[PDB]
Design a protein around this motif. Structure first.
Motif, short mmCIF file in Angstrom:
data_model
loop_
_atom_site.label_atom_id
_atom_site.label_comp_id
_atom_site.label_asym_id
_atom_site.label_seq_id
_atom_site.Cartn_x
_atom_site.Cartn_y
_atom_site.Cartn_z
N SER A 1 0.32 -15.14 -8.04
CA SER A 1 1.48 -14.24 -8.18
C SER A 1 2.75 -15.00 -7.80
N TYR B 1 4.48 -14.52 -5.18
CA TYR B 1 4.48 -14.60 -3.70
C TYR B 1 3.13 -15.04 -3.13
N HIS C 1 1.21 0.02 -14.46
CA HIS C 1 2.27 -1.00 -14.42
C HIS C 1 2.62 -1.37 -12.98
N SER C 2 2.71 -2.68 -12.73
CA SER C 2 3.01 -3.33 -11.43
C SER C 2 3.76 -4.61 -11.77
N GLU C 3 4.93 -4.79 -11.18
CA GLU C 3 5.64 -6.08 -11.08
C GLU C 3 5.73 -6.45 -9.60
N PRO C 4 5.98 -7.74 -9.26
CA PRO C 4 6.04 -8.14 -7.86
C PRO C 4 6.94 -7.27 -6.97
N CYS D 1 5.83 -4.04 -5.00
CA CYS D 1 5.07 -4.09 -3.73
C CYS D 1 5.78 -3.20 -2.70
N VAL E 1 1.45 -0.61 -2.84
CA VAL E 1 1.38 -1.59 -3.95
C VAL E 1 1.37 -2.99 -3.34
N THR F 1 -0.63 -5.79 -5.48
CA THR F 1 -0.94 -6.75 -6.58
C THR F 1 -0.56 -6.16 -7.94
N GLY F 2 -0.54 -7.01 -8.97
CA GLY F 2 -0.21 -6.58 -10.34
C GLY F 2 -0.64 -7.63 -11.34
N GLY F 3 -0.28 -7.44 -12.60
CA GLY F 3 -0.66 -8.32 -13.72
C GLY F 3 -1.84 -7.78 -14.50
N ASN F 4 -1.86 -8.05 -15.80
CA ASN F 4 -2.98 -7.73 -16.73
C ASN F 4 -3.25 -6.23 -16.70
C1 LIG Z 1 2.86 -6.00 -7.94
N1 LIG Z 1 2.54 -7.11 -8.82
C2 LIG Z 1 2.13 -8.34 -8.48
C3 LIG Z 1 2.05 -9.02 -9.65
N2 LIG Z 1 1.76 -10.30 -9.95
C4 LIG Z 1 2.39 -8.20 -10.59
C5 LIG Z 1 2.38 -8.63 -11.98
O1 LIG Z 1 1.76 -9.60 -12.30
N3 LIG Z 1 3.16 -7.95 -12.82
C6 LIG Z 1 3.03 -8.10 -14.26
C7 LIG Z 1 3.86 -7.29 -15.10
C8 LIG Z 1 2.74 -7.35 -16.12
C9 LIG Z 1 1.78 -7.46 -14.95
N4 LIG Z 1 2.72 -6.98 -10.14
#
Ligand code: A1ANA
Ligand code: ZN
Length: 140
Positions: free
Chosen positions: A81, A83, A98-101, A104, A118, A120-123
């Motif tokens: 990630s 971070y 949906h999750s972006e960094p 959190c 929150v 983690t995120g991705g995929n």
């Molecule tokens: C909270 N968090 C940590 C991440 N690494 C992500 C993340 O990869 N977000 C992307 C947006 C498409 C998934 N979201």
């Protein structure tokens, strides 16, 4: 960003912990991405004590609360990630969403109160660091 405020405790993502949090440390665990610091003022949040697998989370990158089904807290490989490096994270719950960094710290909540934040995120998944096993947050 975001925190849980329960009694005189502040619960945050370990990777977002401030100098003030570390200077006022109660407990931290890198494997769970959790840090707890002490507060002067008492907090508005209640911690869930339950094995719910449904709830609602706040997603700052959408300004929306989403209802989700989520897995029980487990040890999960997380890909790299912004971070953290690809690694195993413990007490992690996953949902489709949906999750972006910067999401959190968003709260996940059930009928019993705050489940987690929150982490983690991705995929197309969102991962939440569980706090429901942290019984000591309720006292002292
Ligand atoms: C909270 N968090 C940590 C991440 N690494 C992500 C993340 O990869 N977000 C992307 C947006 C498409 C998934 N979201
Ligand atoms: Zn519950």
């Amino acid at each position: 960003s975001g925190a849980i405020y329960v009694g005189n405790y502040r619960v945050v993502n370990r990777h977002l912990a401030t100098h003030n949090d570390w200077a006022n440390l109660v407990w931290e665990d890198s494997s769970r991405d959790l840090l707890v610091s002490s507060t002067t003022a008492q907090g508005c949040d209640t911690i869930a004590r339950c094995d719910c697998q449904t709830g609602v989370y706040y997603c700052s990158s959408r300004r929306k609360h989403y209802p989700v089904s989520f897995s029980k807290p487990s040890l999960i490989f997380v890909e790299a990630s912004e971070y953290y490096p690809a690694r195993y994270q413990s007490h992690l719950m996953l949902a489709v969403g949906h999750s972006e960094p910067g999401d959190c710290g968003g709260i996940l909540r059930c009928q019993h109160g705050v489940v987690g934040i929150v982490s983690t995120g991705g995929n197309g998944l969102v991962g939440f660091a569980d706090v429901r096993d942290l019984l000591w947050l309720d006292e002292e």
